[PDB]
Write a protein that binds this ligand. Structure first.
Ligand code: MN
Ligand code: MN
Ligand code: MN
Ligand code: MN
Lengths: 203, 203, 203, 203
């Protein structure tokens, strides 16, 4: 709850080379995610009555929040939640293909990992402007591939995110420039499916 | 859960005269609410996996529903939920002013019943086209006055409805025609605050 | 331009019996349309620099209007324009089927009157809540059938309206109650296609 | 009209150093804008009846375009028009402050260049995600400062663009990383106000 904290990456900024550059990892965590946490805190400071609430609860009830902080919480709260999930998913050393219960769900609803990789790529490439591509779970057991604009998080619509891929240009511009496709091809080498499995099971 | 049922009014169609006419009460319940229940059921028939879900759960996760029934559930599910709350709120013989815990909340957040009546009237009058005016509760204890378009229900945004007022023209046209203001003046004579208190407490 | 005036209806309130009742014609014209004109004028009253502009132009440039009157102009200016067209299209004494240049376009593009009636009926029935169904022309010479919510007029999006059918409940509730389909069957008996032809030629 | 062409940039990629880096100018023009032109042409290729229309007209009539190409035209046609204006406004050798008729309008309406810089800076900084900040004119002779998301161009809403500043991360990431504010301070050093003056006169 408030005051929110910037989580440590938990690994060196250079750990994902040559897939994502150390310079991006550092700026992406310290400057972009850092700003989101600071701004989120700045917006909630004025309202003591909301200090005991988890960010996910704030995002599901955005319409209830005072009108002067709705946008600030959506943007920075979403920014904080998305990136926190992202750092965890990039943790080095985990399985490079789906495993466990998430694997079963994937093979059963999409056909196999190759089919899911095509849908998520199609979703990430298709998101015009800034946004995230996601594999989400709904309360009825169904998996969905979708994209959201800017820092919007699927929890706002009642989904539970399992995998999220950051497609804002700041995520890949320094190393890939306009080549978002090459950035997505590299992301598959670094996603930690054991972490995705933890997210799916708690889901 | 599915198959949904049209609830009985629980009172004679003529019980609210001369405030709302018996002919409207009958058409409003049998034809309008009846159609919503039928259409809601028609849309869910194709998806066995959703047959054990309460309408409120369906409405909070609209984005998860198959794309071919999202609109049908929003419109008819919302229509079913709104009118079901409405018939209960019009039950004859209850308190004509807020009472109990809802009263305390009202006097504390709005100043008193007269101030709440001005905000809800302003909200009902201000809803252009079809819609509902509502007194809702959020998870943080705050009361809000808002209006929604068509058959949208505040649960879609994470609120719990306490009082809802139907401002579609079919609710007042036969007796009041274009005079929505006169219809709202009459509604205060028939709202059951003991029922509103039941809704608030379970909220 | 400003000050806007209620147009004459042009024929006796009872001219369209038994298809549309006299009472509806009186209230629809004097009370509903009378209210839109009054409210539009009140909005524009505080902005002299907008006094010599036709309503079509204001609607095409809603985003440019002062912030405090954009909704008022969209809703009331749209209401004024929509009903002004409607009274003319209902003028007694014209062709009951498409004629002339509009007929050639309909035959070519939709296959004939029968196909268009069907499409226009589907658009009217499918407009949930308050709204209008339209046959419009775009700058490229193509015809489209679409519906708009509340009092939105298709000029807002660049189209030129040819035929508009009011589907707000006030347009049919006194005579038809919930039976919007019976109202639509009856409307074909009163449309004036010689008027539709002028709208088509002129744009 | 179709086929659309990539406009010449007009000056060496390094002409705007040290304010905008040469590498950004090359990629922005050849790769980003080159992609928008290619994608726009591919969309319009299957619709000959739209071949002699200027891009401004297509954007004003998006709702009239075939359903399957509306997004493609909005995004790529908007991208083509936005950047075409941008290259011209960055032409070396013009006035660094407003001049002529546009200067009189700015002085009258905003109080002077200083006040406008401030307003334009606020709009650019406040555009969350991808977008553009603009100084536009409406048909009524008034100037507005606003921002649009992604590649939306203000002609979609009836405005005539005078000054547009690209705030997508690709416009500033190689040199400035997250520091959008430093990029905006630098942009004032390269804007060409003689060009802005022509855009203003011409509309
Ligand atoms: Mn990011
Ligand atoms: Mn109703
Ligand atoms: Mn009407
Ligand atoms: Mn750009």
């Amino acid at each position: 709850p408030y005051p929110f904290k910037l989580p440590d990456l938990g690994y060196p900024y250079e750990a994902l080379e040559p897939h994502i550059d150390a310079k991006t990892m550092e700026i992406h965590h310290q400057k972009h995610h850092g700003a989101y946490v600071t701004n989120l805190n700045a917006a909630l400071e004025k309202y003591p009555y909301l200090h005991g609430v988890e960010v996910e609860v704030l995002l599901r009830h955005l319409a209830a929040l005072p009108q002067d902080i709705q946008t600030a919480v959506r943007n920075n709260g979403g920014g904080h939640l998305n990136h926190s999930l992202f750092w965890r998913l990039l943790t080095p050393g985990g399985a490079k293909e789906p495993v466990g219960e998430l694997k079963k769900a994937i093979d059963e609803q999409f056909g196999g990992f190759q089919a899911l990789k095509e849908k998520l790529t199609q979703a990430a490439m298709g998101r015009f402007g800034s946004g995230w591509a996601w594999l989400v779970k709904d309360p009825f057991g169904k998996l969905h591939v979708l994209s959201t604009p800017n820092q919007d998080n699927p929890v706002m619509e009642g989904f539970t995110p399992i995998v999220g891929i950051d497609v804002w240009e700041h995520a890949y511009y320094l190393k890939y420039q306009n080549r978002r496709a090459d950035y997505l091809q590299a992301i598959w080498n670094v996603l930690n499916w054991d972490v995705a499995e933890e997210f799916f099971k708690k889901a």
